[PDB]
């Protein structure tokens, strides 16, 4: 019917309707909740391979219908023609093909409907590179770099999402096979032990065993693995001159700096799918801005990825024998008052989680009063430390699936056949 | 499905859930969108006839399972005579274990408690002989008494009779059996706990004398039969406290701070075989984060934060400085150590959760799944620390459980 969502911190009542538009299924059942679950469910909007003209039509026709209706214009004459140039094309291609309006539209849109993004405030501020002319790897590595180049902005950081040549047949796909444009490597040590970034180990090793020659160290820039055409994926170096990192150091602990830790300045997400239309662009890298928890609470101190609280704690001089000390949550702050304070120093994009969750709250008021709602993942907007103190811990809040949108997809090389 | 499976994304564990068919009630979610962080997804309104017959014998049949006795000639016995009762008095009588075995599985069944490894060990007070809130006072303080255990909390219930026709509740007013009294002040300031200023208010009208300070406990405020509610104090003697001091901040003790010992929870309903015991406050013990968390440094509530980062130096001039989080941590270090050091049962949130992780396991392992709310289950601090943040969880309704019911104010016919 009509489902309203509370805020428990201020009384506000927001009522949605815009959920009468979702076609997905959540995973969710009157008598299950799957809202803690990564992928709940494997509802897709056309079958496995190159679909029918009764398949992709009519997903076609929607996201038309949408574009012409959000510019106030919906059975115009140019609608109606290119419902017709829509419909000539998947008769006579099995596809078709995005104006560069509808593009833009599609790719900002899948940002709005991103259900798990706290930063969707800057939805519609977004540089669209069109790479749909792309054929090879090279030139994947030169539209990625210029992507890099632009999005860093010598610390300014601007969003971007360059889009490649979407699937075709299935067997054509561009894919960019880092799940980041830019990682650090992680290395499998003899003694057990690892080295570098562990969520990475199997990425390094595709690397390695296709030519790489590893430095093995804790932070190295892994290359890129372009595919393009379906062919065989392809190393390059992104140039270090474009890597943009801060080194990590702590306004009062001057013994921070000697842990020698640092990371990459934009986070750029390389594996995931684009739904548009029907359309899938298999390679769609996006890239924004952090918020300092994904780098120090996540990327350093969960258990499988640098797990680094031990020795930031024992620096402290911490009381470690028992949990009851909280010193994991004490060094967990101070690490993270450190991430902040090298980005800003540096003068390096960067949002803190308290102005973060800020800035989603007035995106939801905003979504709620002009489109009728703002879909959004309560697990994953709430960050992962001081959950209650931030805003968003106290909002509720409605997940549902609207298209265009960003889904996840296998990793190739669980499906790439070598030649 | 037939199974569900979930994963743990730190460890890789995988689970397979086949309990969830066995569940009956609404999550709130459809197919088609999720409603896992809503917190509520007549009096009239009591199970007719027909209605109690097939929720009595679901509730029957799954406690001779339990036993080991289903199709038994006791069971088959049971079963009839439950119906019987149906039949001529509109409603049934549980025996005693079946009370006890329904109390322990609305515990072992609530998806949002993380503290449920301790489900099977829970004392019942069966009260239903209970008929005027002067009898409700006598076994709360008995129940108090018995759990607080000189602190070494031992968790309890203690279960009113049921409903009858709606107009007849047994209900705590109280939300908590020990809860501090919060005042608005003229100027718009809150002395005492912000959260129960309207109970608070209720109390003085009815009669209470408050001392308006800032950690008064409040009075009991009970209803037997539908009657108009009666206060009570509980014995002083019997309220036990913690003041609230810090293991390396010699100036925190000056802040004043103090908490009481024993959660117990009164404002919830438990539904047994279709049965409604609209009175049946429950406790067990605190997890450190309940207090230094939410009930200090909620806004709306005691609202701490700017004091202690104020003693503790911090720059508050901008959020990116973290002083909230910094001054987080130490508060719930002082809850604990405060706790431990007067011998007052209390588990913080990382022991809690890795305990939760291990039932968890162990409730898939011998029932084929375990419903959880990971939105309730993930501490309130420092959530990806704990293992619970990386477990996928199942959530859906068992019963018997657990419920929410509207405030007694809302609904009471004020005789
Ligand atoms: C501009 C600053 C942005 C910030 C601060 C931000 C913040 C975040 C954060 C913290 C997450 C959780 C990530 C994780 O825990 O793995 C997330 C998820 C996500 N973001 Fe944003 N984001 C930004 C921009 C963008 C842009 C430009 C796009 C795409 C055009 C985008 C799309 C997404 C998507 C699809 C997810 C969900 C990914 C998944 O389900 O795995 N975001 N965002
Ligand atoms: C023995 C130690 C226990 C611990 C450490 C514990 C811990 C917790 C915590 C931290 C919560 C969330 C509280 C909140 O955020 O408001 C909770 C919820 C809950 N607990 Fe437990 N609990 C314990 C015992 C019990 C017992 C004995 C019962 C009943 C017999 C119980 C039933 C529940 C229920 C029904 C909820 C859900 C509350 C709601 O829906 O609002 N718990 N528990
Ligand atoms: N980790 C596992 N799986 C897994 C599951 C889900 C994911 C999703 C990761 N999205 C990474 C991501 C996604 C979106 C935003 C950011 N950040 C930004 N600010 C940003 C980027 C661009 C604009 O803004 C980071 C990744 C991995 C795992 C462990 C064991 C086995 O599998
Ligand atoms: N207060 C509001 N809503 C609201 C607040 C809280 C709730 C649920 C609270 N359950 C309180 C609770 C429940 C269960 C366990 C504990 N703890 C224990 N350790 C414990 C007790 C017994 C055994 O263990 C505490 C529901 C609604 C609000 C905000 C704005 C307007 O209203
Ligand atoms: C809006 C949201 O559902 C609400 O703030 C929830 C979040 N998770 C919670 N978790 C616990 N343990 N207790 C709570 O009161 C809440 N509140
Ligand atoms: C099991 C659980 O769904 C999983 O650990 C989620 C929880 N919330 C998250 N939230 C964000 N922002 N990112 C994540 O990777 C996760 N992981
Ligand atoms: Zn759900």
Redesign the interface.
């Known amino acids: 019917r009509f ?1 309203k ?2 805020n ?2 201020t009384e506000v009542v927001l009522t949605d309707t815009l ?1 009468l538009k ?17 992928h709940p469910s494997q509802h897709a909007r056309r079958p496995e391979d190159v679909a029918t003209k009764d398949q992709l039509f009519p997903l076609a026709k929607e996201f038309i219908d949408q574009y012409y209706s959000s510019i106030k214009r919906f059975g115009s004459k140019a609608h109606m023609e290119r419902l017709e140039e829509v419909n000539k094309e998947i008769d006579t291609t099995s596809t078709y093909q995005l104006k560069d309006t509808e593009l833009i539209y599609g790719a900002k849109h899948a940002w709005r409907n991103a259900s798990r993004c706290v930063g969707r405030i800057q939805w519609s501020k977004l540089q669209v590179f069109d790479a749909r002319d792309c054929t090879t790897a090279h030139g994947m590595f030169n539209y990625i770099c210029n992507h890099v180049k632009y999005a860093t902005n010598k610390g300014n950081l601007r969003s971007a999402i360059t889009i490649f040549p979407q699937r075709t047949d299935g067997k054509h796909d561009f894919r960019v096979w880092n799940s980041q444009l830019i990682r650090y490597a992680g290395y499998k040590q003899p003694d057990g032990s690892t080295l570098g970034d562990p969520a990475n180990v199997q990425f390094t090793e595709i690397c390695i065993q296709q030519g790489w020659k590893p430095p093995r160290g804790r932070f190295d820039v892994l290359p890129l693995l372009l595919q393009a055409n379906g062919n065989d994926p392809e190393l390059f170096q992104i140039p270090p001159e474009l890597v943009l990192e801060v080194p990590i150091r702590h306004p009062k602990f001057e013994w921070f700096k000697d842990l020698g830790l640092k990371w990459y300045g934009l986070p750029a997400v390389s594996n995931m799918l684009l739904e548009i239309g029907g359309l899938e662009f298999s390679a769609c890298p996006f890239s924004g801005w952090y918020m ?1 928890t994904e780098i120090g ?2 990327d350093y ?4 990825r640098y797990n680094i ?1 031990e020795e930031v704690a024992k620096k402290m001089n911490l009381d470690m024998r028992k ?4 010193w ?3 060094a ?2 101070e690490i ?2 450190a991430v ?2 090298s980005f ?1 120093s540096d003068k390096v994009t960067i949002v ?1 989680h ?2 973060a969750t800020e800035s989603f709250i007035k995106h939801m008021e905003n979504e709620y009063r002009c489109r009728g709602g703002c879909p959004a ?3 994953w907007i ?8 931030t805003p968003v ?1 106290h ?7 609207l298209t265009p949108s960003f889904e996840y997809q296998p990793d190739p090389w669980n499906t790439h056949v070598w030649k």
């Open positions: 489902l969502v509370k428990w911190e959920h979702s076609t997905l299924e959540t995973g969710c059942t009157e008598y299950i909740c799957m809202g803690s679950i990564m300092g609470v996540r101190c969960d258990n499988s609280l949990t009851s000390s909280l994991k949550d004490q967990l702050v993270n008052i902040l304070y800003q803190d308290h102005s993942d309560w697990v709430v960050p992962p430390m001081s959950g209650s103190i811990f909002q509720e809040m409605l997940n549902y699936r």
